[PDB]
A paper describes a structure:
In order to reveal the atomic-level details of co-translational folding, we determined the structures of a series of nascent model peptide with increasing amino acid length. For this study, we chose the human Pin1 Trp-Trp domain (WW domain), which consists of 35 residues, as our model peptide. The topology of the WW domain composed of three strands and two beta-hairpins, which form an antiparallel beta-sheet. The structures of the intermediate-length (WW11-MBP, WW17-MBP, WW19-MBP) and full-length (WW35-MBP) WW domains, which are fused with MBP at their C-termini, were determined with X-ray crystallography.
In this study, we prepared WWX, where the X-residue N-terminal WW domain fragments is denoted using the format WWX. WW11, WW17, and WW19 take an alpha-helical conformation. The structures of WW17 and WW19 form helices in the same manner as WW11, in which the region of the residues 12–15 forms helical structure. The most prominent difference between WW17 and WW19 is the torsion angles between residues Ser16 and Arg17, however, they share essentially the same helical structure. Though WW17 harbors residues 17–20, which form hairpin loop 1 in WW35, their conformations are not identical to WW35. In WW35, the loop arises through an interaction between the backbone amide N of Ser16 and the carbonyl O of Arg21. However, in WW17, this hydrogen bond is not formed. On the other hand, the residues 17–20 at the C-termini of WW17 and WW19, where hairpin loop 1 is formed in WW35, take more extended conformations, while the conformations are stabilized by a kind of the short-range interactions. In the presence of 30% 2,2,2-trifluoroethanol (TFE), which simulates the physiological conditions, WW17 and WW19 contain about 25% helices and do not contain beta-strands. In addition, the crystal structures of WW17 and WW19 revealed that the region of loop 1 is different from that of the wild type.
Residue numbers in the entry: 1 to 387
């Protein structure tokens, strides 16, 4: 084995009552999914399940559910099913919070092999794969018929649009997920992937490539092309109201842009130092709470209602999922240019590790970016800390 991620002391404080029966309600399904996803669409699938079974399906979307789940599940409470990108699930699994899932070989053949890989932890399947998420460059086609192919061009493009009372680019600077594609472009990485194994001793958050990418970000801010305060909501409002020509976001965001006046394109992220931006790619996945008394219901719901063409379509019509893991539905989606873009950024990026250390990693990088962007620390100082 390998050294446990930080916080064993705290996980042990949650020990009492863990398995000593604390109740999730038997005879229904409670599901957690992030509020940016198609949770209404998911609830519709839930209604279909209820019609066929008499089993009520309740979908909730609490803020910070990826942090709340291990807190509530460790005591044996929480949702029956938790949706999040696969990167959090190895930590959950190592804490004992997830049931191993048991799809037969027939079912497994309906999803792409690499998506099962993403939800396999220490040789065992610990969640159902749903969709493949990659960030793309989203741009206003009226403001910008030809989107920039490089990060390097964006300051000049900004000067251009500033003269027209617009700006070039706004995206969420508070979550490192969104700046990671730039940090990784010139060689930053999380953990060294050697011989099919992640080396937790070899972290690349402060190598030359990481520093170059983060420095480019902070220079954008220094030069008033971006603002360190910009978050998800600010950037989205600004793009969807036509004040900024570009944003960086995932497929879930398209629905809101659709309802806007903006005629937009979805495309490949620009290069940095001549190399592709490398988004960390997530597989939206559904795990079954180890403490759930409804595991067979959860299985049935996920395999026979959600992971179907009609199930994923209900969710997708609410908020687009991206490239889905279900082969039959993905062949249909693959024709959308926006999904093509999603797929290109996905293959240029890297499927996130699911190892238990990912939570600590993201927290470290989150702090590093925020501190460097605000000017509280220098790029070198901030990244040195993260290592
Ligand atoms: O920023 C750190 C954060 O990145 C990823 O979270 C994504 C998630 O994958 C997407 O589904 C979407 O909801 O946006 C999130 C970023 O705000 C990781 O999956 C997550 O563990 C990590 O903390």
């Amino acid at each position: 084995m390998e050294k446990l991620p930080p916080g064993w002391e705290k996980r042990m404080s949650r020990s009492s009552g863990r398995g000593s029966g604390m109740k999730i309600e038997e005879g229904k399904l409670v599901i957690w999914i992030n509020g940016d996803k198609g949770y209404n669409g998911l609830a519709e699938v839930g209604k279909k399940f209820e019609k066929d079974t008499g089993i009520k399906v309740t979908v909730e979307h609490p803020d910070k559910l990826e942090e709340k789940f291990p807190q509530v599940a460790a005591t044996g409470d929480g949702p029956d099913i938790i949706f999040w990108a696969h990167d959090r699930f190895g930590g959950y699994a190592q804490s004992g919070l997830l049931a191993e899932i048991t799809p037969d070989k027939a079912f497994q053949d309906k999803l792409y092999p690499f998506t099962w890989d993403a939800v396999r932890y220490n040789g065992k399947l610990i969640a159902y794969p749903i969709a493949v998420e990659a960030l793309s460059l989203i741009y206003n086609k009226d403001l910008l018929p030809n989107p920039p192919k490089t990060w390097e061009e964006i300051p000049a493009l900004d000067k251009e649009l500033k003269a027209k009372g617009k700006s070039a680019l706004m995206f969420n600077l508070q979550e490192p997920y969104f700046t990671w594609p730039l940090i990784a472009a010139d060689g930053g990485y999380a953990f060294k992937y050697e011989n099919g194994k992640y080396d937790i001793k070899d972290v690349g958050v402060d190598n030359a490539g990481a520093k170059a990418g983060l420095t480019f970000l902070v220079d954008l801010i220094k030069n008033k092309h971006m603002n360190a305060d910009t978050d998800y909501s600010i950037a989205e409002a600004a793009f969807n109201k036509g004040e900024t020509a570009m944003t960086i976001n995932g497929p879930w965001a398209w629905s809101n842009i659709d309802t806007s006046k903006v005629n937009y394109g979805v495309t490949v992220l620009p290069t940095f130092k001549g190399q592709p931006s490398k988004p960390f790619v997530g597989v939206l996945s559904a795990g079954i709470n180890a403490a759930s008394p409804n595991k067979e219901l959860a299985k049935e719901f996920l395999e026979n209602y959600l992971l179907t063409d009609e199930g994923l379509e209900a969710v997708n019509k609410d908020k687009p999922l991206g490239a889905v893991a279900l082969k039959s539905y993905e062949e249909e989606l693959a024709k959308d240019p926006r999904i093509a873009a999603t797929m290109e950024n996905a293959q240029k990026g890297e499927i996130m590790p699911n190892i238990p250390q990912m939570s600590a990693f993201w927290y470290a990088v989150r702090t590093a970016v925020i501190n460097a962007a605000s000017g509280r620390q220098t790029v070198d100082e901030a990244l040195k800390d993260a290592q």
